């Protein structure tokens, strides 16, 4: 669900030690991050382990693996989410391929709620 | 000539994902067909719930009143896993509802939309709360449920010993699914399932036969894991008996008009809505019928959505069949 | 006080495959318990069959007088895969029924168990063969079906039209599961299930939660494939609503009184006899109940099976609750 | 149900090219010999191919390959079918293997009912 709108085009930017890139819930309503329970990153089909992931939500800045205590920061329907990813070395020019596969926390639903995507983003500058 | 039209906003989640329509443009196109009665999803289209504030509830009452609009439903959730390696506590779980019950009350809602799997002890144990804000508890009943399931029957003991008038159902259209729904069926093979055996499918719902052999045939002819999942789907959407509703007429507060597809005759392509909004009548029902488009998740992969002529075709339908 | 106690010779099976109990045998056991009413199964007990001469039908008339019992139902099967390939043509499926009408006829029964699985189609083509021999058709109702069941609905349609007296149902206890049986529950550990997670489903299933989401979570919690299985259960056995039986009791010819497990008490422990009764009696039922013991299926893994003994138990059961 | 009572006991005996041995059927009811879908042999943990097998019912054997013609042949319930198993040796005196392992065509039930057994049985003269 929301599948095809979870990595947002023309979002691909460098940060100090590695690159951001916006990303969308695949949810019909907003979550909060706590039950995210996964979000597994790919840059060029690398993964991205949690350690080196952090959301940004507003003005909140969260690391991944902190996210249990997150339980009322709301990753609101449609909202785009800043997801950094610190990578081993400098992203060139030119495209590269994002990909994030969610498994959500849903108490109504007895096993994650999967959703995933991936897109080929143009370094923006 | 009782029965009353309606819209959750729910319908409308596509286009205000995208940003193509505000909360209030929703509303406006809910007017535009006559659908008066809104229902909305605070923590689908109203951020900061649960802390909104007096702006907000005056200008959304406000806005009713210059649409000619109704505030009549609110849809809660619960988010019982909302701490890793536990769920919430009752006491939490109350808390929780309190605050729906409070928004709801600041939205000038009547009634509440209680997810399905709210257990009875939690709706018996925020009851002192509904009733201090005079507030509707309607717990949905969707596929594959119905109001002979043991889950239900054991709601039903709860509120016939408690004894409240405000602790009642809201059916969802999709316990009326008469057919294995197009739009469903088409993104299977998308998804590449094999068209032979969607086909047996289809049919063997039709037919009525057991969700668990359909599952089993499926795979015994070779179905490929899509096929599979296709056949499982027999345990999710379900027929039930229309005339079942006549013996819980009392406690029905809402209803559902759950859709996936509105043909170009304003026909919905699998839903039951012909057997059913006759029962209502014969049964004197007076709540309103809220539109709850859910084609999106079907066709998003290869159509554009447009979720208001979706809804605008099932308001023309709910008024023929309702006699206006 | 016109509920009548019978048995199914079903209930014998261990001790009929194992040459411990000769048909008579059954019979015999049957009588010494007051259960005058009996239902047999030719496929099971009367080699032979659909051959079976008049030496034999003379022979079982005069066995029944000899032990003042009644031959109330004969239990049809119906193997439409008989043939690799293909299912029976509808024509073969009536030669098929027309034999065990055939058979019940002589046999001297007044009802007839049709499989679940039979369709409305096949009753409905069938229904002239039955009427030439009195022969009521009672379409076996078990679980997870229940008379609200689409299948059952259909059925439904279809005897409102035809509007014969004899098609009918043989509703079967296994619908009144209220606890999850424990001789399922025991033999399960004893092929690998993980304890804790047992005690999850049983507890879950009191609690009436969707077999869907106990399956889920099962395998979200990490069960091993017993516990899967165990949890799928779920899908497999059901309680429904006890005063559903009052709207059709004029099509409840016959009861299959199924149970797994009598205690040391005389009392069932996991199927719904305290509820159901009185409402047969407050419906006027004046069929028999006839003892359907399938307990031997789940303990003879690990335990001698006792057919009679647990039989005699449940027909003490019977006799209390009906009022004897 | 009934696995335990698949291989009969005392019943393996040795016929021209290979061994007998008595069967019961994992199943509450007679069954036509049509609807026996598998009956996989092995004898000593060997397979015996289904076409070196026969079912012997009263006074009828017929080659298990040709089950799909015997529609109303029916295995009785509790009846012991004598199994032949053509092997390719003798089988020397002592204590030998017999696995059976059947799936059922059970028309009511949407995959094949299944019911398996061993025992370790002694080569009766």
């Known amino acids: 669900m929301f599948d095809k709108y979870i990595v947002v085009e023309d979002s691909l930017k460098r940060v100090p030690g590695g690159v951001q890139f916006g990303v969308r819930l695949p949810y019909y309503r907003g979550l909060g991050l706590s039950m995210v329970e996964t979000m597994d990153v790919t840059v060029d089909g690398e993964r991205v382990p949690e350690e080196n992931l952090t959301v940004t939500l507003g003005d909140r800045t969260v690391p991944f693996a902190r996210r249990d205590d997150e339980t009322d920061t709301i990753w609101n329907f449609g909202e785009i989410a800043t997801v950094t990813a610190r990578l081993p070395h400098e992203l060139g020019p030119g495209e590269h391929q994002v990909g994030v596969n969610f498994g959500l926390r849903i108490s109504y639903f007895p096993v994650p709620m999967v959703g995933q995507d991936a897109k080929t983003l143009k370094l923006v500058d | ?324």
């Open chain 2, 1 to 324: 000539p009782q029965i009353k039209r309606g819209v959750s906003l729910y319908s409308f989640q596509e286009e205000f994902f995208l940003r193509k329509m505000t909360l209030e443009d929703c509303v406006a196109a809910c007017a535009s067909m006559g659908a008066y009665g809104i229902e909305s999803l605070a923590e689908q289209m109203m951020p900061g719930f649960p802390n909104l504030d007096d702006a907000f509830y005056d200008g959304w009452h406000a806005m009713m009143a210059k649409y000619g609009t109704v505030s009549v439903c609110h849809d809660m959730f619960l988010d019982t896993k909302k701490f890793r390696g536990r769920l919430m506590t009752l006491d939490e779980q109350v808390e929780s509802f309190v605050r729906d019950i409070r928004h709801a009350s600041r939205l000038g809602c009547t009634v509440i939309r209680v997810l399905n799997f709210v257990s009875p002890e939690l709706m018996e144990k925020v009851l002192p709360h509904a009733e201090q804000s005079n507030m509707r508890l309607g717990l949905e009943i969707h596929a594959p449920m119905h109001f002979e399931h043991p889950w239900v029957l054991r709601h039903i003991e709860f509120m016939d010993r408690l004894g409240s008038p405000l602790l009642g159902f809201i059916p969802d259209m999709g316990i009326f699914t008469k057919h294995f729904p197009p739009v469903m069926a088409e993104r299977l093979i998308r998804q590449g399932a094999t068209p032979h055996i969607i086909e047996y499918i289809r049919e063997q719902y039709d037919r009525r036969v057991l969700a668990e052999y359909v599952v089993g045939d499926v795979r015994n002819m070779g179905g490929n894991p899509v096929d599979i999942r296709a056949a499982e789907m027999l345990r999710h959407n379900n027929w039930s008996n229309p005339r079942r509703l006549l013996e819980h007429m009392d406690r029905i507060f809402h209803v559902h008009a759950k859709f996936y597809e509105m043909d170009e005759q304003d026909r919905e392509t699998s839903l039951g809505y012909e057997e059913v909004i006759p029962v209502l009548k014969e049964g004197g029902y007076s709540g309103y019928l809220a539109s709850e488009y859910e084609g999106n998740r079907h066709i998003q992969d290869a159509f554009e959505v447009d979720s208001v002529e979706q809804v605008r075709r099932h308001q023309r339908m709910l008024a023929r069949l309702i006699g206006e």
